[PDB]
Amino acid sequence: YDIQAWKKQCEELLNLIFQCEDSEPFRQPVDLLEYPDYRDIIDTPMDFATVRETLEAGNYESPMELCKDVRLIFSNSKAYTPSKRSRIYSMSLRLSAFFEEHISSVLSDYKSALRFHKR
Numbered sequence: 001y002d003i004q005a006w007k008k009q010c011e012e013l014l015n016l017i018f019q020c021e022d023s024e025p026f027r028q029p030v031d032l033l034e035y036p037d038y039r040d041i042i043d044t045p046m047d048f049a050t051v052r053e054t055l056e057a058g059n060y061e062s063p064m065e066l067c068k069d070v071r072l073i074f075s076n077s078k079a080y081t082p083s084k085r086s087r088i089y090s091m092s093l094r095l096s097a098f099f100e101e102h103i104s105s106v107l108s109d110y111k112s113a114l115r116f117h118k119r
């Protein structure tokens with residue numbers, strides 16, 4: 001029932017994500033010089049360095065907010081891909097499966113702790 005435990009859990013999950021080779025395209029904001037039209041398609045850019053910095057700044061109140069930003073990295077990849085068989089998109093799908101598998105207990109434990117707090 002520790003309401004703050006999610007933060008270190010998210011830090012450790014982001015560390016695992018940065019070790020994953022599949023996170024390479026998503027570790028830093030997309031380079032507009034490499035993808036000139038990216039901002040015509042993507043309204044809200046997101047990347048794992050921005051997620052980590054937001055977390056470390058104390059600018060996430062809950063793991064749901066972090067999860068929303070991580071899911072935005074994956075939905076941006078899907079929206080920008082020219083093909084469902086593209087390399088970067090294919091990496092995003094494996095990374096998303098790994099993220100979802102690991103964030104599930106973080107979210108469940110936080111929501112349970114908060115329900116206990118408000119009992």
Ligand SMILES: COc1cccc2c1CCCC(=O)N2
Nearest residue numbers: 025026030047076077080088
């Ligand atoms: C954070 O990096 C993202 C985010 C959304 C979409 C993509 C990428 C990587 C490079 C550009 C790309 O092909 N797709």
